[PDB]
Design a protein around this ligand. Structure first.
Ligand SMILES: [K+]
Length: 357
């Protein structure tokens, strides 16, 4: 990771664009110019945004770089950065960097930016406990459990991800600038003890419930919670519904496959003011009842319209053998549990038996 003879830039830095970057950094005339290790040692800062760089191979010969600005390139592999022990600032917005193992030994890194890299797994960040400023906006993150180890963070952006569980932030009391817009957040309790916040953003949450059965008289708990745990009153409710604290209630004589409600809550934590607003979406399934009739005695099972019915364990009537489920007590036809899908209405199936030889 050192050169011992004057060596052309183009031989050290194999990516054409990055070689030109080094050339301009050292104020050389040409990527053909030979440079010494002492010149390479002099590089403290590289600014090469939007420069169509595909690889930084060769950067490992720059032991003293402390700030690296590489936003808007085509990087995937940052392995050549792994031994830049003095790296302090590292900006890699708008690349496709996902393997963060190569950051493991950058123990002086204090500011990291990786926005719009398509990242989901940030567990690699546990090796950067000294980190102070972290920007991860516009990624695909759902699990921020690792961040509870990053107790020196005072500036943190997680906006435009898919986060619902912010409890791992609860202990990060040094936090002063916190960006959480455009996630899946419905419960602010984790933020309650962040007494040092100055900037806080909580706009535009989308909160998706697991599906439940549609019903004429539908009741859904309000799950939107303030920093003190109190429920946030809905701002407006779909499908003519009403709020009956703590529940949202609808009258739905006709099936619809979704109801929803919108919420808005001004929030103050320490010195920071924010506006927590968003939408709770509730998918509904259209269900009807299959009555299984065994010689007049009935068991009722709910089934979603248009799906296959899973046949039950068959009845055993001693002295007889079960022959199947039919659409009429006598006659009709046999239900085919593979090709007959659930009707859009209640109906009955009748067990048919044949006496034993
Ligand atoms: K609706």
């Amino acid at each position: 990771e050192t050169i011992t003879v004057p060596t052309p830039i183009k031989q050290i830095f194999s990516d054409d664009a990055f070689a030109e970057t080094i050339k301009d950094n050292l104020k050389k005339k040409s990527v053909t110019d030979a440079v010494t290790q002492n010149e390479l040692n002099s590089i403290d800062q590289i600014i090469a945004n939007n420069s169509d760089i595909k690889s930084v191979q060769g950067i490992q010969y720059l032991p003293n770089v402390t700030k690296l600005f590489l936003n808007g390139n085509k990087l995937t592999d940052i392995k050549p950065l792994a031994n830049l022990k003095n790296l302090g600032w590292l900006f890699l917005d708008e690349n496709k960097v996902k393997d963060l193992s190569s950051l493991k030994d950058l123990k002086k890194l204090k500011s990291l930016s990786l926005e719009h890299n398509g990242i989901s797994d940030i567990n690699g960040l546990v090796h950067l406990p000294q980190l102070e400023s972290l920007y991860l906006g516009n990624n695909k993150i759902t699990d921020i459990t690792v961040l509870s180890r990053l107790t020196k963070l005072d500036t943190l952006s997680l906006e435009d991800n898919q986060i619902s569980d912010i409890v791992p932030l609860a202990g990060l009391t040094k936090l002063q600038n916190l960006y959480l817009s455009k996630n899946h957040i419905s419960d602010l309790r984790a933020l309650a003890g962040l007494k040092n916040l100055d900037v806080l953003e909580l706009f535009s949450q989308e909160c998706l419930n697991k599906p439940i059965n549609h019903q004429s008289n539908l009741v859904v708990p309000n799950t939107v919670k303030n920093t003190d745990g109190s429920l946030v009153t809905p701002e407006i409710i779909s499908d003519d519904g009403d709020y009956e604290k703590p529940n949202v209630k609808w009258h739905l004589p006709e099936f619809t496959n979704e109801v929803s409600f919108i919420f808005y809550q001004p929030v103050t934590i320490g010195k920071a003011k924010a506006r927590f607003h968003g939408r709770v979406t509730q998918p509904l399934k259209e269900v009807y009842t299959v009555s299984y009739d065994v010689d007049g005695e009935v068991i009722k099972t709910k089934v979603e319209a248009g799906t296959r019915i899973t046949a039950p364990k068959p009845p055993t009537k001693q002295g007889y053998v079960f022959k199947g489920w039919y659409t009429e007590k006598n006659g009709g036809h046999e239900w085919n549990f593979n090709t007959d899908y659930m009707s859009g209405n209640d109906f009955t199936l009748y067990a048919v038996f044949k006496a034993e030889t």
